[PDB]
Amino acid sequence: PSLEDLLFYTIAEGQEKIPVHKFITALKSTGLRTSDPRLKECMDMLRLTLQTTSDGVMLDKDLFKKCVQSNIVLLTQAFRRKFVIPDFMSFTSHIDELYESAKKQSGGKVADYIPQLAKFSPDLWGVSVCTVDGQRHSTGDTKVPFCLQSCVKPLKYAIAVNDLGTEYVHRYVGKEPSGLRFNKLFLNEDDKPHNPMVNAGAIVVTSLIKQGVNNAEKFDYVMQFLNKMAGNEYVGFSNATFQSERESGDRNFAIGYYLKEKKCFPEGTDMVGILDFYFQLCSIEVTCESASVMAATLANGGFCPITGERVLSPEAVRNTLSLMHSCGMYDFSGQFAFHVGLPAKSGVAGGILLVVPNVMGMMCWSPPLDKMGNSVKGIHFCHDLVSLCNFHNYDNLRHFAKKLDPRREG
Amino acid sequence: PSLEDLLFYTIAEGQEKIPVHKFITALKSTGLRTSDPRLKECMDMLRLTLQTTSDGVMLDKDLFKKCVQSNIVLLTQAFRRKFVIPDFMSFTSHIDELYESAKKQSGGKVADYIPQLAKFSPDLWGVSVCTVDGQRHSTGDTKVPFCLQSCVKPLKYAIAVNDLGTEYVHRYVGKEPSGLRFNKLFLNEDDKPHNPMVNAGAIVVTSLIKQGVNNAEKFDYVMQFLNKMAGNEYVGFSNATFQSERESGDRNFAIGYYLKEKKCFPEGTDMVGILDFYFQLCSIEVTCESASVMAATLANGGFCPITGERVLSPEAVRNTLSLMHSCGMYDFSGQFAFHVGLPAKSGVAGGILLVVPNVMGMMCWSPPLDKMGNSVKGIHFCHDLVSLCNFHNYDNLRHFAKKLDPRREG
Amino acid sequence: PSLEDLLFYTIAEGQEKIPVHKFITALKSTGLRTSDPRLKECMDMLRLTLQTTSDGVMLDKDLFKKCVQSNIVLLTQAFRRKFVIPDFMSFTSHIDELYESAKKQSGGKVADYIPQLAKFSPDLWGVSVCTVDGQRHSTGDTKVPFCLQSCVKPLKYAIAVNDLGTEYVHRYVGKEPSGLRFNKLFLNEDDKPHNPMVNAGAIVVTSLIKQGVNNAEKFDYVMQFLNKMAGNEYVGFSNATFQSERESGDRNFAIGYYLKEKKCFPEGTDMVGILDFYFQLCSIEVTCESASVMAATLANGGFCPITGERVLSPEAVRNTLSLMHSCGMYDFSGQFAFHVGLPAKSGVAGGILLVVPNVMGMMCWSPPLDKMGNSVKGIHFCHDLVSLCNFHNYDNLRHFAKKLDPRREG
Amino acid sequence: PSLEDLLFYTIAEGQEKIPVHKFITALKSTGLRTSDPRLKECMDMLRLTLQTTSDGVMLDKDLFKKCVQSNIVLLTQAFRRKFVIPDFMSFTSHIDELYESAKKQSGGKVADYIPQLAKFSPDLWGVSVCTVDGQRHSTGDTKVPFCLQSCVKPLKYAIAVNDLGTEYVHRYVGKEPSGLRFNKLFLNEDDKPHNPMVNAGAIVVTSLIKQGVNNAEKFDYVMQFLNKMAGNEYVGFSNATFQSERESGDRNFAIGYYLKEKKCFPEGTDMVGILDFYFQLCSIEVTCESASVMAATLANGGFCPITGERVLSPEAVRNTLSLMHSCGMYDFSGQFAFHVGLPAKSGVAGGILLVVPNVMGMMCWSPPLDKMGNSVKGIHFCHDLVSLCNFHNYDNLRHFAKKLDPRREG
């Protein structure tokens, strides 16, 4: 009694033959996209079958077997409800409601210190989800590209820890929040930036990645790596944002000279070059969708959930998630950790990279920022989400009052 | 047939009768203690039956059932390996190795600013575990009473949030680490103490509890509360420590007057009484074992694992777990959060209250402190614990390298 | 058949009955003594059986069985050559050659040092062997009482590590030898005595044992511990040696005051009293034979060989053997470790307590000392022993030139 | 019956023929490598058989006999579980766990001295095992070449004693640790370096080897010797490390001139030349794997375990193990001897040559050293190994508490 034929009877309902669209609809209903890279062989085979059998279109036990066999393990887990969120449909309806609520939150100011962010409508609002099992949902403007900006800080920190290890990286950068009123100070008392999520800390992390090669390869190396975290969905680049960011980055240069003088960099660092590399990494583009997959890779201990590819070490991902928890939301970091209790990173373009460990990754995007620099609708959404679901780090998985748990059912 | 007989033959193993000792030994190996409050009916019925047949002492099926039917759901759960740590006997052997490794860390200094702590041996060292299912383990000096000191701070903060709610409580006290810099200041910029885990914060929290009634009743109420938390295991009081603490609390009187002048207290507070109540709370005694149960209540969403009682609202436990993560280990809070990733609270007696959410609570106790004020062996044990098991809060449950996961049979 | 009968036939050579004396002669030849504590039940039963009849005395199978059934495991082991040295009769013959050869080393000088050792005569010379299986051999003056003097140092250090543990004991004393040039300093750079085998170290170890009771109770307690170690063989006390020790004790008082000033003792120490306790411990009396048992308890992982009792924890015995290796023979410790490769401890009375781990314990005793303070004859014998047998710690058990291995048969 | 046959039925299980892969799998599970030089005849015959029969490929009892006849003794020992560590599979699993435990110890600093050992990273960590029976296991970075450095000191001292005797060699060098730890001084009071494991002792030992010929012959001579100890596994040379060591050896030139002036060399010694030879010997290269075989030769009384060849005299190997005990780990020598109780030698590349007498040889390697100059990870591993197994010199083989003994089974 193979997997293939016993799953066959599940969708077969008791009939001899299965509608192709009935299979596809059932597949989608689990939250998997038909374009999922782990489902390619099966999708090619279904397409091929539609060609070679216009006499249909319905799958015999043996025909069904011939399509789904190469992707059979995934298809089972999907259809035997063993995914991290069993009732993904119900969950996405909740996501949509959360979305509609934050959509009514119209305040905040779009960043305008360079013309490439002043341009973005205040009304763009997008939310994407990717579970650690690759289940997907999106609502709103989730295919509009925007710059990562500071959302890239944890990503490049993760690359650094991955390539070099914790101990080395943290010779150069600390692992703690500054404390909300040592905002302005570049260095902690050990003459290290206090953590990798502040600009000074990010600038030093940037200086550690791929030492020795030029910025072109350095950038290519980081771009490859983001491609994998995103399961090869959209990772772009804004040159316009880069040119603007470098021509108006006085404080970043102020930080650059300070760090150099305090000898914060590895020997042989070309600081002005590192600053230029730093502006490039800030100008790297995503959509909500592709970024949600990056977040999911961090939710999934370093494996990209839609390719099954190991992208980062567990050590790299844990460190990163630790610091997004405590340092990722600027001056709202403590507030956020307290009330939302999720690892997250915001950016000046309006992105909030969000991780729900062992469940899912998200990217919420809306350009208007609050006084602290976080997307208004993103922050509102994040609070609501943890109000609804027992996703708070220190929520309990067995005793959680009236909170809903999307990891269960009846 | 039914649960009791189903269970009966499991322990029975083909033969007709079960010896009582063979049932008791079977039960212990699940990690439940025979004195478990939820197993009282069963043990009462065993004592009656061991009175009935000095003739015995076997148990046939209907007699076995007579003993266990009242506690059958718990006993089945225990015996069919449904507990949070299925192979607990393997897990305690790991705890024992961890224990012996920290035992070799003989450095640090016993607090001597008051004589009651000076007298404690630098060689006392105990660790106690209580899982969210009531499984128990201890190694070392675990029934020796010692004062909570600052380990009580999250307990009384939990009580305050439980009785009054988050929002009211945090009108008087903040929700963020000061961090590690700065760390002499009594108030943040909103003129609130930074958080509940610092002295200034604890003092203010102490003032919110059971307002209106006198300090004798307040202490009573908190004792009863700590009783529920410990599942009625050992909670006491060191009057000697109380006297020492109060004739040596210049700094907390300095804090008290500062807070009073800044109007940090609720209207109608007698600040000097509150400072007397706070010193009392610090002088409350526990053992490793009874404190590990309190920690398990926090691990278990507010339900005391060995009684089944709801002690704290889930709100209270979350808030508390949040602030123990970022603020619970003094100047080592950030390092500890980064490296151990567990909510914890230390005290100057050498206690470390440790919570592994959804898994277990622990108390570690060894009087010698490091220069930050944390128990040396406790700190070493805690690091090792998380080097071994995937208990770090930002460990992945599915992809965790070569860490051990005690929640699985692998 | 059964083991008693199997054993019977062995000792009965097909003959119908075993004479008692024949069984006794057969038993002695294994190396066991008839007075062996583990063989009491059997000897009690041979005494009773030899009372049943004026003469007799034969034992048929059921009578033999009657006497030997209580101790059959040990008797079988002895008779089927399972003892650590199978051909023990051959071995004692080579102990005797070694003895006679050292007997011709008449050089050296008795400690005139105190009024009690000056009368002890340079012709006395005895060597006793006790293996880890209780096999015994003696040659020369082995029942003559003499004081342990510094041979007591590993014994009292073992007691301390046994009662208090390694980490406590070594807060007070070190675990290395100093310079052969710094054999005059009392303290190392951490202001602890160098190790337990020097006077300053021994004095500090003496202060650790049974704190809180008077020194007459402390002395009793060490004597009790020393009784277990010798399997209740001779342990005494020389008041004479004690008096001359305490008057000629200027350097110990010098060390005493130096340790006091440098705060080397446990809090609440009466240094002057400790010196007096110390003088008593050095004046404790043994014979060659009883001391060899003490040495064999150390050879046997802390179990006394002729009684089976767990006398010392493995930690105690290992710690003790390690420090006898490097620190046990004064200025000759280095040369002795290199050439003899056995843990040993000498004393000014002429004694050398010798441990061959996993094989045997020995006491060698001969009052004339060389210019380093070690018994001339003892040192000569220890050299010859390791020249003859592959007992050196860094001899190879498989490839050992033309050395003899007593652990192996033909 | 013939051994070949008796062994045949073992693996035959009950069948008439043995599948070749099944014999190979059974062989390797003993820990023997198929590439073992003692198994060459058998492996050649098996390879030949696989050629001369495209059939099977299964061994008749007659065919099997033809393959394994010439190596029958060793194959018997291997299959009848008579190797020093019977359950090698279980042991290697324990090696791996110790490995993973030391792997999380990322402190220490790579030996920066004249930047080019700095070329390979602080992340390299490998452990290789070779038993005295030739059983092999490796984990981590064990085929990366690194320079012996000071790890070569015991090897060239063993060569010297082998060729010259103990008496000659120790006219020129001492037998003792410099004591507590002055290796400020080059000479002891007899104007001899203290022992062969200090640089002045190593330099003087170097001057002893192969006197009369030039340095290339001397070097070839020691290299062929190293080839035998390693069973002809990798022994190389780093010219890079040599030129470097040669231009950075002021201290060694300071020692060289001191020794010359104090007449420490043999008559006719060209000191500056000897220093150059000395630099070359430090620059000799091994892997973890080949070095483990060297250590195993020392563990096996001077016979290389994987060739059965006599490389060093028992006197040479004993002398070397005695001095590795007390003088092998720099300043940690006393502490290491106490806590680990194994002969070991560290080098500044991060290697630790470790001998467990009569059991196995090991090489641990991790470049980051501690303040004393010993590999952080190696030291951690060595401590953990002796905590786990009863391999400490002065562990007892019969009574050893909770330690595991891998020389045993049930």
Ligand SMILES: O=C(Cc1ccccc1)Nc1nnc(N[C@@H]2CCN(c3nnc(NC(=O)Cc4ccccc4)s3)C2)s1
């Ligand atoms: O803040 C204000 C006034 C203000 C108030 C309200 C609104 C607008 C302006 N002015 C500033 N001047 N300079 C600043 N930062 C420079 C650059 C980085 N830094 C250090 N980084 N690390 C250092 N080393 C340390 O140890 C930490 C430290 C510094 C000061 C006090 C305590 C600790 S200095 C020194 S900010």
Ligand SMILES: O=C(Cc1ccccc1)Nc1nnc(N[C@@H]2CCN(c3nnc(NC(=O)Cc4ccccc4)s3)C2)s1
């Ligand atoms: O100010 C705010 C609001 C705020 C917060 C953040 C940013 C802007 C405004 N709240 C508070 N002010 N003062 C407080 N505590 C009392 C008074 C000062 N103190 C000392 N702390 N430390 C003292 N001694 C020293 O700072 C040298 C020293 C340094 C190193 C080693 C030894 C001494 S006095 C004890 S709470």
